[PDB]
Amino acid sequence: STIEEQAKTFLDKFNHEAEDLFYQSSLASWNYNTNITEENVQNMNNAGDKWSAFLKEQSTLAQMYPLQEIQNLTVKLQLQALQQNGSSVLSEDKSKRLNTILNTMSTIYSTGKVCNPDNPQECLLLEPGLNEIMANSLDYNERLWAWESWRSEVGKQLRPLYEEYVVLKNEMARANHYEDYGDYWRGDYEVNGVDGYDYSRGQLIEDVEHTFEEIKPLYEHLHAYVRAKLMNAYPSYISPIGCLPAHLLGDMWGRFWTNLYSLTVPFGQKPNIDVTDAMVDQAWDAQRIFKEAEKFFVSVGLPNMTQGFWENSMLTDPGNVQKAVCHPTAWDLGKGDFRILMCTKVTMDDFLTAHHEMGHIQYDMAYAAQPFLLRNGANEGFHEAVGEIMSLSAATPKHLKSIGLLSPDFQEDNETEINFLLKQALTIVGTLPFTYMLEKWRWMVFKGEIPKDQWMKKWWEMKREIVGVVEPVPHDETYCDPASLFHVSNDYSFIRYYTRTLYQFQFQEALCQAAKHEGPLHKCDISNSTEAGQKLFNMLRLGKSEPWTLALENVVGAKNMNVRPLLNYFEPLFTWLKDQNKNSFVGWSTDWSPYAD
């Protein structure tokens, strides 16, 4: 008769309705993804509209339950996840305006195209031409042109749209009793009403700043080494003490440094490990790759994939008569239906992507016993971390030797180890300053600490101070360079990648300590270790029913983020850079710019 029993009954009804409706929506979307037509899009949109209308009705019904009289933590969490009105808290015209702004920004980004006046008739979009130019070209002028042209084409059109988006999102958040939209975002890590495991929304700011202060020396050494190699490659465009130009970071924005491996290889005469030829020789197909991934995953005591996974998932390119958008994704359609939709080629990259998606599917299978609203990671950074740790374990030469893909006569020495470590650091350590800078800028903008007449100025000085990347051309306030990124213009949070990077190394070090791995961390493997598998599953099957701090403690013993595992992972590379940079400078100055003459 109390509010607790009524809320319990309401949630029990909502679970058994939303499960079926979301399952139908996901089934329609999957039927669209394996067989793309126009009627398939119509069916998918109809199912999604039904699901969204039902969710809106249920949120409206849930809003009439006072959370102040709710005692159970799980019921409170479900009611709080359901009571998020979101865009409905504003008026109708303002909501339509916000949706129009969002769609306009998405379209401006996805349909952007820019090219020099040499021939305004032929030029490619971002995805197929500009990404290729940013990754593979080594010409300073071409990369600078592509960078500046994409900026002037996208940010100049997104600036007023993004300002109106910012003020509308601030109004939406302040209507929801939040300080700003950045606070609404940070609410993903906020834990309340639980003693010892609580977490505020400024505690995340402090933890991120502290972890980055700890990271700064390793990233500084890596930045110095990359700058030295690039000045050896670009003799007349890099300063000995200056920052790194933005258009020379291997991609359109500099998010990752993966494409700088060819220019920054430590030992070019030593070929990196690549087992695609051994897979071709031993007649390995997609089925064999996924079977080996399943064998690896069950070696650590995790259950194998169900029959429905093998019967329903699309593991190969379905010919050419029918098209399919086969970007590798792990499908959790609900009601026990897990699938992987991926065009699997016989390569090592796809061999690791299979392990990543199987880790996602295992994490999905772990918390299937949780209620519908509690079927997700502990926060927005646990899924990808659990996915990345499995690929890390599979990428070691020891595992390749065990599965036969590497001959026993392979001589693992310090040179291949340093090469692999530097590749992993370009992939991983290079993105943390960029991610932290971008999220800090977005937070400060949403908090009003940055006026409109200083957006780009503060953004670029934060770049110079934190990331160590100086813009190649001077940008005034008419630009909206941050909006050029996909995750920014499409209203997506960005700190999840920082938390993913930290949590994956925390999990890896914890499991390697549980597996009694002796030696460096970059040579660790969790295979044939049921102890670490059980330690991981203990956090996997939690879902988001418990505070993410408790889920983290369940594996690493700590109640907060820890950066010591990352340094323990990269310490051989760190000593290598400390020995290599003794005859060079380590750091950067903000005064130098590529346009200073």
Binding site: S1, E5, Q6, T9, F10, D12, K13, H16, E17, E19, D20, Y23, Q24, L27, L61, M64, T306, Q307, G308, E311, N312, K335, G336, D337, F338, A368
Partner: protein, 194 residues
């Protein structure tokens, strides 16, 4: 001295819903559960009180065969001393159960493309059922204290949910046909043994 009609309860083209399970009274015949045990097509046969081979050379007064369809994760609730939705609000089995349940996956028959919603289960109720009790009433369940006179509204909703059975559902969500055999002893003479 005729065979008991086990085919009509095992090989029926349709099965009753779990909230409206049908009970068949089988008597005045002969029965051989050996083929039922050695069929090896059933995924669940678990009971305490009689062994599957010892119940053959042992007969009672009357037997009851209850049939219905549930999920895959919900099969365990059909057992003595169990709780949950089906154990409380749909199918209550006493602790002194002298028989056990026969379950088998039926994703090919009871599930079609789009979802087979012909099977319903009672989700909410004012109290738990008694052993072998059945409630078919469809009165709107009141969750709060204000009356609503049997209409969809706040804290009022229809107390029956339809099972969504697709052919591509998980093993825990595929339609599992459950046949429950209950045995009892009274002063009536033995009718079914051979």
């Amino acid at each position: 001295t005729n065979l008991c009609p086990f085919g009509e309860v095992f090989n029926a083209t349709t099965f009753a819903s779990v909230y409206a399970w049908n009970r068949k009274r089988i008597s005045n015949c002969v029965a051989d559960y050996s083929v039922l045990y050695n069929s090896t097509s059933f995924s669940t046969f678990k009971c305490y009180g009689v062994s599957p081979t010892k119940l053959n050379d042992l007969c009672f007064t009357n037997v009851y065969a209850d049939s219905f369809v549930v999920r895959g994760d919900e099969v365990r609730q059909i057992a003595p001393g169990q709780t949950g939705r089906i154990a409380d609000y749909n199918y209550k089995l006493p602790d002194d159960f002298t028989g056990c349940v026969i379950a088998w996956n039926s994703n090919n028959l009871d599930s079609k493309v789009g979802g087979n919603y012909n099977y319903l289960y009672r989700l909410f109720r004012k109290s738990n059922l008694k052993p072998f009790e059945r409630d078919i009433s469809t009165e709107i369940y009141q969750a709060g204290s204000t009356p609503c006179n049997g209409v969809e509204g706040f804290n009022c909703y229809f107390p029956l949910q339809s099972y969504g059975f697709h052919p591509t559902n998980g093993v825990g969500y595929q339609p599992y046909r459950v046949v429950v055999l209950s045995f009892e002893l009274l002063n009536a003479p033995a009718t079914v043994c051979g």
